Design a protein around this ligand. Sequence first.
Ligand SMILES: *C(=O)N1C[C@H](NOS(=O)(=O)O)CC[C@H]1C(=O)NC1CCNCC1
Length: 259
Amino acid sequence: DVQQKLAELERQSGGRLGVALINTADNSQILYRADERFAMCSTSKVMAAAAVLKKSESEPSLLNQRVEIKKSDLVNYNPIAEKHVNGTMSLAELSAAALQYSDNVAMNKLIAHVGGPASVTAFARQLGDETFRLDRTEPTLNTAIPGDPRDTTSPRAMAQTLRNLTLGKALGDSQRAQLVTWMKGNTTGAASIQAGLPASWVVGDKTGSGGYGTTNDIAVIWPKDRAPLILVTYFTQPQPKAESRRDILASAAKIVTDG
Ligand SMILES: *C(=O)N1C[C@H](NOS(=O)(=O)O)CC[C@H]1C(=O)NC1CCNCC1
């Protein structure tokens, strides 16, 4: 059965695997270590962008507001922001960069705008997600030290929240659509959950990686002519310098779907 297959995959992987699937056809779930904490890494960018979208509902100019980019903002991973040094990007542009290029400067500007990691966390609490915690900014939020609760959530909580954000009513109509549009346009993701699904299925996802070989993906999935699914696959390893294992996420996706 599905639980045995996931346990076997986890054993083969040598690490710790967390899965939560929500099938909106029947409100059923497939859960594996779904209440354990895992470091989110770049998957936390979805919540930061959603927090800005929420604020924009009462401030219609917000997505157009200009944010300065300076050398001092640069970190290491900034493919979009590094092209606008001494200029500005709008909050919409920063959201797109964070979600589609995983730019870490862009994430930091979303965090700062809403008031910092504790404000992103407070947004999650307002949604009814009492598990999510964003503690740090980029780049340090990705350390993924085993046993460290900073910058973690559980698969169950993140699946339920991603469902709320992309399919439910957490966000206004325009803002929900915007988040879905951004996630459907991500430039990565094909090697993770998508690699375990049929070619025809439509996916909006956000990946992440970090210390301890942490390899993550969170997705909303539209199978052909079926109600959507939400899938969270989090994975981390014992060794600080372990390499990423996107194949494990693909394999988990294949196990928990009928595709
Ligand atoms: C997110 O987890 N990131 C951002 C960037 N893109 O990876 S993706 O998987 O999101 O596409 C690089 C990996 C990761 C990240 O921020 N890693 C840190 C880079 C700086 N050193 C510490 C790890």
